[PDB]
Amino acid sequence: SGFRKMAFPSGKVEGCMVQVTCGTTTLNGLWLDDVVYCPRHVICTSEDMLNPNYEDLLIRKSNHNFLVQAGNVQLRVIGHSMQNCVLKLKVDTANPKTPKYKFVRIQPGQTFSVLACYNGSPSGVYQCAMRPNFTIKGSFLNGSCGSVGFNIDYDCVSFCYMHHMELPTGVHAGTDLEGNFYGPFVDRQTAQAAGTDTTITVNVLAWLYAAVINGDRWFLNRFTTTLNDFNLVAMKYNYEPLTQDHVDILGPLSAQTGIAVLDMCASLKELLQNGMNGRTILGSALLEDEFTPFDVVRQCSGVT
Amino acid sequence: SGFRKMAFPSGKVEGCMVQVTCGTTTLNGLWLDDVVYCPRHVICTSEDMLNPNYEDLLIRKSNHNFLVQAGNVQLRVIGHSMQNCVLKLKVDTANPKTPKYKFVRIQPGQTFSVLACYNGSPSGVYQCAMRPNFTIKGSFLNGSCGSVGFNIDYDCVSFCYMHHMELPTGVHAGTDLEGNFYGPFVDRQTAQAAGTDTTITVNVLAWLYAAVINGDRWFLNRFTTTLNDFNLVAMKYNYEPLTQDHVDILGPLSAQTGIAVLDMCASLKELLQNGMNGRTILGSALLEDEFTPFDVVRQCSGVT
Ligand SMILES: *CC(=O)N1CCN(S(=O)(=O)c2ccccc2C#N)CC1
Numbered sequence: 251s252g253f254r255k256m257a258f259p260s261g262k263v264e265g266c267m268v269q270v271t272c273g274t275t276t277l278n279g280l281w282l283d284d285v286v287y288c289p290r291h292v293i294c295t296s297e298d299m300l301n302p303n304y305e306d307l308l309i310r311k312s313n314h315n316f317l318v319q320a321g322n323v324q325l326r327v328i329g330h331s332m333q334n335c336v337l338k339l340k341v342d343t344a345n346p347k348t349p350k351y352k353f354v355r356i357q358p359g360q361t362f363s364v365l366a367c368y369n370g371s372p373s374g375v376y377q378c379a380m381r382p383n384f385t386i387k388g389s390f391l392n393g394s395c396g397s398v399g400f401n402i403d404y405d406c407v408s409f410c411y412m413h414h415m416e417l418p419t420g421v422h423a424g425t426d427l428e429g430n431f432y433g434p435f436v437d438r439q440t441a442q443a444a445g446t447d448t449t450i451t452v453n454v455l456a457w458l459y460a461a462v463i464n465g466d467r468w469f470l471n472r473f474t475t476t477l478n479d480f481n482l483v484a485m486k487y488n489y490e491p492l493t494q495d496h497v498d499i500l501g502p503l504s505a506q507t508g509i510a511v512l513d514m515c516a517s518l519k520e521l522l523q524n525g526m527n528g529r530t531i532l533g534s535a536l537l538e539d540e541f542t543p544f545d546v547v548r549q550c551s552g553v554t
Numbered sequence: 555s556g557f558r559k560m561a562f563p564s565g566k567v568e569g570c571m572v573q574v575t576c577g578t579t580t581l582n583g584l585w586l587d588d589v590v591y592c593p594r595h596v597i598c599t600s601e602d603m604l605n606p607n608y609e610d611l612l613i614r615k616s617n618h619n620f621l622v623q624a625g626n627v628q629l630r631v632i633g634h635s636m637q638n639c640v641l642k643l644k645v646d647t648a649n650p651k652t653p654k655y656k657f658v659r660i661q662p663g664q665t666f667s668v669l670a671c672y673n674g675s676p677s678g679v680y681q682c683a684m685r686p687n688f689t690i691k692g693s694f695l696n697g698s699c700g701s702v703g704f705n706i707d708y709d710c711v712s713f714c715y716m717h718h719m720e721l722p723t724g725v726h727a728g729t730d731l732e733g734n735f736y737g738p739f740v741d742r743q744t745a746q747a748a749g750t751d752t753t754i755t756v757n758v759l760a761w762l763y764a765a766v767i768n769g770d771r772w773f774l775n776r777f778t779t780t781l782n783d784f785n786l787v788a789m790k791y792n793y794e795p796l797t798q799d800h801v802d803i804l805g806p807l808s809a810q811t812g813i814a815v816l817d818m819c820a821s822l823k824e825l826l827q828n829g830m831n832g833r834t835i836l837g838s839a840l841l842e843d844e845f846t847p848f849d850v851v852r853q854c855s856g857v858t
């Protein structure tokens with residue numbers, strides 16, 4: 251029993267973190283096989299960052315300008331290329347700790363673990379969600395860029411995020427491991443505003459199911475609703491529209507608890523309209539939306 | 555910027571987790587050097603658990619009854635002893651991945667990371683606090699016993715918790731790595747009620763400092779208070795008394811922000827008396843008390 255914001259065990263990813271230095275900029279890189287992946291802004295001066303031309307800046311960089319350090323051992327860079335907003339540094343040594351891995355581009359609402367790193371050294375691990383506005387709400391100081399987000403399916407690490415940027419509102423933007431930003435963000439120090447940070451409805455429902463399973467049941471009511479009725483109330487409270495796809499995904503939690511998805515929608519509707527009245531659900535005074543249905547099943551079933 | 559509930563990187567601890575089986579009970583063990591540490595209740599039948607006599611139950615157990623598996627490789631048990639509520643299983647092989655380590659007994663209010671495990675395999679990592687009533691609020695299913703809590707100082711893992719028990723109220727009890735329970739709990743299936751779960755005041759203050767540092771400032775007010783005045787309001791709201799020791803510990807966060815500790819106490823007093831009025835602080839609608847002042851400095855400074 252009990253339900254916690256839980257990150258994946260980070261050891262498989264700790265084994266992949268290196269330091270990348272170009273001139274005076276130090277950040278983190280991800281070493282898989284004989285390639286080190288890092289943010290292309292490693293090549294910029296903070297001045298360059300106002301209006302960088304990365305192809306032009308890269309011309310002035312040689313393999314020997316990219317200093318790659320794994321622990322206190324230097325790696326030999328034998329190649330470099332730009333793919334979108336990441337650099338791929340070919341090194342002469344395969345990472346001996348390379349886990350089974352995939353590069354995946356996640357959808358908004360999908361959760362992942364972040365291993366926050368500085369100078370290629372892990373400082374901590376936390377659970378994030380790709381927000382509907384394609385930001386994440388992370389914890390990232392100067393030097394944390396190239397820190398990665400990931401899921402684990404048993405022994406295969408799926409890398410979904412690399413950290414590149416803090417917006418002036420203190421929320422975070424980054425790329426998949428092909429260097430494509432999530433959302434409309436660019437690696438330039440310019441006016442970039444996030445859109446509406448809507449609540450991930452299907453994740454809130456998952457978390458209400460988690461609460462019921464762990465004995466927090468006070469919010470269950472005598473009502474039901476329809477997808478269309480629920481969605482009227484969702485729109486009004488800046489919740490994402492609930493689709494039949496989301497309902498289908500909640501099916502197993504529905505089955506385990508014997509609470510119809512639409513009944514739990516009606517509970518959530520009353521919570522939105524009435525508030526918590528100073529009560530808590532799983533130790534929170536607001537409706538948590540950074541657990542996927544898959545997360546709730548994983549934690550409630552004990553997958554490794 | 556941004557402030558997250560952050561666990562230590564877990565790789566050093568992943569490298570220590572094994573499976574322990576005695577008859578039909580499977581749980582987790584911690585392999586450091588040539589010793590495997592696990593809950594003594596591994597030797598019980600669920601029937602034994604009503605009124606177990608551990609010394610008597612242990613007499614019927616030989617070294618070869620303790621099945622210890624690290625990955626899919628069996629370890630040879632060459633000795634076993636009981637220390638308080640843990641078993642120490644001497645094995646013929648030193649754990650080659652043994653990190654630098656310490657056993658520490660933490661005080662209530664101290665935070666730590668838990669690596670939740672099943673069958674000696676990591677499922678996830680989360681941040682906990684030793685509650686003032688010597689429970690933790692964890693996420694632990696059957697098979698999670700012998701999962702450990704730890705802090706890391708650079709390269710030295712300080713083990714502070716091993717998981718043993720869920721109380722009928724779904725909160726958790728366990729031991730230090732010398733097998734001494736935190737609080738008054740016993741490894742027996744009996745009426746055990748937790749005392750008052752009071753709020754860790756010094757941790758809330760730390761977290762308010764974290765909020766100010768990350769730009770959440772709306773709760774700062776024009777007031778100050780005294781330790782005695784604050785403590786009257788603390789008592790009334792089931793907050794731990796604030797001591798000059800706690801004030802001294804908040805000194806560095808005081809200095810960084812230029813907010814006198816007692817001024818921040820006065821902010822916290824107004825929050826307790828007035829509530830949040832539907833506002834949030836660092837994404838929470840309630841006052842977070844599972845960050846120590848040390849945690850806030852670590853995360854805000856980026857220690858590895
Ligand atoms: C996340 C991270 O480590 N960084 C992003 C923010 N910068 S920076 O804006 O200070 C900067 C300085 C010099 C050159 C490039 C950049 C960028 N971007 C620090 C690195």
Ligand SMILES: *CC(=O)N1CCN(S(=O)(=O)c2ccccc2C#N)CC1
Pocket residue numbers: 579580581595598599600601603694695696697698699700717718719
């Ligand atoms: C945490 C954990 O893995 N366990 C504690 C709860 N038990 S149990 O109560 O089901 C039990 C069954 C058989 C023998 C001993 C115990 C105990 N305690 C499962 C293990």
